[PDB]
Amino acid sequence: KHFFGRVITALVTPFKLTGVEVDYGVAESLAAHLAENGSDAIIVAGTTGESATLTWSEEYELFRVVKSAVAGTKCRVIAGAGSNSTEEAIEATKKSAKLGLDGTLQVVPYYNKPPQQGIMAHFRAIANAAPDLPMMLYNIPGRTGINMTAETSIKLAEMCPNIVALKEASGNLEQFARIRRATSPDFALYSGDDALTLPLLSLGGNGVVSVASHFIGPEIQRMIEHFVDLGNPEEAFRIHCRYMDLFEALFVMANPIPAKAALRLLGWPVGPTRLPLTDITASAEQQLRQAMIAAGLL
Amino acid sequence: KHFFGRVITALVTPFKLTGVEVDYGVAESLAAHLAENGSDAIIVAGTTGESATLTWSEEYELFRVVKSAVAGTKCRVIAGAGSNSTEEAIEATKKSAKLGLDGTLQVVPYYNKPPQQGIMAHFRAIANAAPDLPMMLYNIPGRTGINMTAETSIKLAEMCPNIVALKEASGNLEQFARIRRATSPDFALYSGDDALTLPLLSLGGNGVVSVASHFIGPEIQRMIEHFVDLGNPEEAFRIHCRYMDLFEALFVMANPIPAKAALRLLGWPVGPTRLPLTDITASAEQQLRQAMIAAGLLS
Amino acid sequence: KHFFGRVITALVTPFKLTGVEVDYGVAESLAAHLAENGSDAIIVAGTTGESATLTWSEEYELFRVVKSAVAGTKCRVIAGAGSNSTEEAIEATKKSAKLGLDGTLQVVPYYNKPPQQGIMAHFRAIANAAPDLPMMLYNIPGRTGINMTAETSIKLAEMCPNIVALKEASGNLEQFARIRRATSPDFALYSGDDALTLPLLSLGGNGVVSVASHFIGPEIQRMIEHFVDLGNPEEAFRIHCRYMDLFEALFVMANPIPAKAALRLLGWPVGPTRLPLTDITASAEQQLRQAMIAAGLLS
Amino acid sequence: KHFFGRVITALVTPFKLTGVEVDYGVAESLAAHLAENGSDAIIVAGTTGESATLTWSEEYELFRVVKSAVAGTKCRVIAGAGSNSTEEAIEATKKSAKLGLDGTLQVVPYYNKPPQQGIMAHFRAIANAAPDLPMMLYNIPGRTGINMTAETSIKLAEMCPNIVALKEASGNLEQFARIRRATSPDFALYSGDDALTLPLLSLGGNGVVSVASHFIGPEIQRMIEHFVDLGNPEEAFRIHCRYMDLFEALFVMANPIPAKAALRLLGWPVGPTRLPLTDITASAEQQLRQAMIAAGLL
């Protein structure tokens, strides 16, 4: 019923041992594994994929490679093609169109703090650069340093018909409800935060763009199913409760440091992160390892 | 299942025209009206009841009068008996016990910013001063200037068996979930904020300590019923949506300025607020009036 | 130039060993000591004096006793007579007038979050209740839960001629500068925070309402003197630097828990705090003790 | 007395009418004007220079051109060469060394939220990539989404001898005092905020990295002189007061939208900003224009 589904995994970007090169091979098999484990869609080279330290070429190859890894399946492949420069976002979005990806994810500009009319112009121009490519907006004030308001989000959903979803990680519940109330039900509203998935479902949300779906995709699907389809909020919450420690553990250091460490411990050789992200500490690794054991993953 | 129910109304305190005296008569009939319109419990002389500008005598008379107004019904009467002085809270809690009220509401100390172990000692001593009187804690960092943590709340629920509920208005969803996960299911977790009732239900919440239940109590009951009992989150949300503008309108100036204005417009002569709360402005009254008309309360 | 001077000490309130009674004797000798150690004025029964857990009678006795302890000297005695109830503030301010104290300190209402026009009406009414009694406003959003804006503060300084000072502890530098720019130079602007005294002097401030002046009053006087009178910011900063660890230490737990612990370590038997304030932890006491040793106050 | 002086101007980047090209000519004459009007140093292609929407090539040309515009003067030229990718910052810093600039400005990584030890590794690696290029750190939590602590800043000043200054725009006065107390007096501590210059001087600050020095450089010099040299804080404050409205006006929309509008009103054809920054509103322009008239600038 929604193009990008209920669970979208923000894919980590595997690197070889030194960090210097991407491991496209590990990227393929990891993406294929997610497509058979509850990911309805995958975001490539977004925040969790270390967008900031990838070059544009690396991103374009990752897009091509991940799209081939999941051909055969209903898994949609979304390009993390945003930027705080409209020109750069436009170029990347056009490249995503020519590669035949299923859509893009577009973050609100970070660092340069545009006015609301700037955010709006930024996204119009990007939507216009590939008018037939579905687009998911991404609002994350904690990283960007500004908030896209309800008004701006709603206006964008009306003006550009290829803008069909919003990844809302502000934690602002009123904003989320207002956007939901005023957009058409064909517009998808996704949690950008595993710990907020459940309460955002209560305000009309359609699922989650998740980090934890690398590990518990089918269980996140089951949670959403209990809540939205089967009228069992008590069971949705029983699942949320099983995985709160893991959700906390995945953010005890900045994402994707824990996500990558967890994958390495499960036998997925996704490599280190690139500077400025440093290695997981002994303390954070122990909390993560413990949370994984209690969640039944080791 | 829960002693205080699903919808608890934070009663406004009616005053006569100058503000100098309480109107106990209007208090009685307003409380009777709430008991027959979806209030499972009522809080007397809390924040919404202008606790700060009431004297202790005024509070004690309000308690007595409200308890008689709702005799015959199952509606529980809760004393807003908290303070930032433990000695004062203890005295008021003992008076509530001797008067035969159903419980107390106890705010985290405001203004004086106690440490967590201070908050904990404050509430232990109050629970111990009337060990058979059910108690609802109240966490509201925006007014008090400190936050009662998950750890503190959980520890209090384990130590004192008369502490059976928490009114959580921090808006912190992680805190709320952690408290819920770790307390026994007999422990009630209530939203302290009409706009958060629905999402807190998704994290195991048992309802709301409401301002808006003065006006739409049965509809708030219906929302909670659709969500918890009947498996209809879409309809719960349809109701939340109908009333978001009213919820916004009730806080455009500080509570209870709009609440009292709305009651006056509905024919409830609840009077002004006392200084330092001033009268609602023409601008806030227009936004409130409009929101009430669209919600089907007026004209 | 300014009625309340440059250094105003927010006096702790001594209690006897159980906390149940005030020790008026220790209050007397402590206040006499401050008057001979750079306190130009003393605030009695404010935040640092545990205002919230004192009764009104205890406060009124403290006012009487402290006023007699410093008679003969130019040390001014200020009543912490504020409240979140205008009626209570008015009553206490009238009592302060009849007792012959030198002025009052008046906090922005805490917990009940009045509108700006409410804050303004609250203070007008208090200024009008004793029109000849000098008044110092106190803005502390971290404890009260609201902020008195620059506009409101400036308007109050113009309308009421007995409002002659403001204790600004928002930490907002722009607010502070705007108030200073727009008020007459007879209006005193005081830091409400020992760590902010020096940078607020750079924006035209006239001193500080201090906790640390219990212990280093003459050194705070010297700092202000270097900056304002002698044109030596380098030396003012050398002093600020000497005492930063002590300033940090005095707030590692909520004031006045550390203040009282420091006084006990110096041989001032000021007693415990009252619930909900609990005893200082061994960890905070060690950091405090160490900071005092390095500052040359102890051992 | 310090290498970068007391007033460092964060230079706006002039664009031609469409925004598509830089106007290097206007950049030259604007920089020459600043060097004769109280700028002891100039920062090229930092935040105020629309770093986010400049390409690396545009920045490198701006560096070259600005350096030649001010040859013959004592005005130092600093490259805004930071990034949230350590690799990119390293490459830009090496280019700045080969071009013969006087130093670099290095922002704390934005958007990707590294841990403190990440921030520390980021800056070590950059300092090590050109050990003889003086370096000015830049802490601005409101844009980046994280704060570099006092401990981190102090440790960096001790480890790397080319790290000789800090542009502190957190507005945290305790952090600033602690850094000042613990670093050697050869280490420069600059306000990153025109409205904080004066109170940061009281806590041992050495001046300001300013937007308003485009317009009132000599008056900012006079303020600092009255306070630090001549023992007249009353007169320093009289000057701060004269210019508070202008300081407020310069930030009513995000920098450099007002800065560029002010320059256009003074006859400097600095052009528009690039998306996602949109034009100044009529309302913000009126407040700016009024503040400039009262300050004696038109």
Ligand SMILES: N[C@@H](CCCC[NH3+])C(=O)O
């Ligand atoms: N690190 C820069 C450019 C990266 C573009 C390709 N991943 C940014 O986050 O804006």
Ligand SMILES: N[C@@H](CCCC[NH3+])C(=O)O
């Ligand atoms: N102003 C006091 C009044 C004490 C009586 C409480 N009913 C307070 O807000 O706590």
Ligand SMILES: N[C@@H](CCCC[NH3+])C(=O)O
């Ligand atoms: N506990 C109340 C009453 C204070 C009584 C007078 N000192 C308050 O802080 O306002």
Ligand SMILES: N[C@@H](CCCC[NH3+])C(=O)O
């Ligand atoms: N727009 C990207 C790269 C710009 C590189 C040169 N200015 C960023 O802000 O990180």
Ligand SMILES: [Ca+2]
């Ligand atoms: Ca990307």
Ligand SMILES: [Ca+2]
């Ligand atoms: Ca009460």
Ligand SMILES: [Ca+2]
């Ligand atoms: Ca008092």
Ligand SMILES: [Ca+2]
């Ligand atoms: Ca740059």
